[PDB]
Subunit: 114 residues, 4 copies
């Protein structure tokens, strides 16, 4: 099934943060309404934050995360979790190799903010 | 029910990250084996990362997240999600006031790393 | 924090199902827009599916699960998970005692149907 | 990524329940320790339960769910959720066609039981 795609409330601020756990450089693209709203690029084998920013879901509220290592798209796993019917987490894991640890690039989206 | 307590596999490196979304200064304390392993303190209404570190679950494997605002303990909400039976996320939300948005201090724990 | 409350898309049908794992008779109430729309009850320590029914979220989309044993409300734990940004599960666990297994009455809400 | 495979505690009882929402007859296979341990077959377009049983996770604890409709393997989506660090949910959604509602056969695994 498709992974890394989330529908947030329209015109809503949300945070997006990416961590890296791979020898290779991670390039994370965050799409809002099919348009690149943010890009994070970095390398780390110790869960470093290669990017964190605040974005706005916009009209469609459609947000999609994509990860690639040297142009090659990583396989993704994802899910959305809501706590006490108010706090939202859109979670993404990505695998750029074969060991299937799916942490090479970890992306955490959360909302609402403030 | 008890919230903010997580049983991770023993002696395992994990990442812990806190975000702030409140008018009040958040104090996020991370306990491992019931000992303070890290403490983040910060104020923000725009999801600033007031702290992120890589800790080791230790021999016990017990990780607890505590949040307080100026000495007053916040109410916590939490859960753990596992993707593709391998990628783990321990999620924590906290409420320091009366609006119940539970984002005042958001904490995310992820593993495995590397 | 409040538990057992879920906001479903408006006027959408969903399935609600209850499971029992306790020596005490479980009584599960499902409120839609603050009015009970379904009630299940039974006594099993072998995960018996004590009841299931298709309901409509109505205009409010608000759904709440309440669990009581012999007139006393049980402590609740819950969360919502979304898969492939399409399949929704609203989960509820309940504890009518102190042995901390929170399975005395388990309720699963899923949608969309059809 | 791999889906429908869950690592439960070993030699532990768990419940597996399947619901159907499709014109096609669903065949749900549950394997334990790499051997089919249970099979549910049924049809429903109203979320009716097509099977529910209590099984043992075997020596490795590995439990795998596979769904097919007339020989054709349905695409799976899944995740595990843990509430209050003790109540577990292994969720599976399956798509036997192209409309991608992933509810054709919905499978819920829960533990502990009793
Ligand atoms: Ca990898
Ligand atoms: Ca890695
Ligand atoms: Ca608040
Ligand atoms: Ca807040
Ligand atoms: Ca109990
Ligand atoms: Ca019980
Ligand atoms: Ca379908
Ligand atoms: Ca269907």
């Amino acid at each position: 099934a498709t992974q890394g795609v989330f529908t947030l409330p329209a015109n809503t601020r949300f945070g997006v943060t990416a961590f890296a756990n791979s020898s290779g450089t991670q390039t994370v693209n965050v799409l809002v309404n099919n348009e690149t709203a943010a890009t994070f690029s970095g390398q780390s084998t110790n869960n470093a934050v290669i990017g964190t920013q605040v974005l706005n879901s916009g009209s469609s509220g459609k947000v999609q995360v994509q990860v690639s290592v040297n142009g090659r798209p990583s396989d993704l796993v994802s899910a959305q979790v809501i706590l006490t019917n108010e706090l939202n987490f859109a979670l993404v894991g990505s695998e750029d190799g074969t060991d299937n640890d799916y942490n090479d690039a970890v992306v955490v989206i959360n909302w609402p903010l403030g």
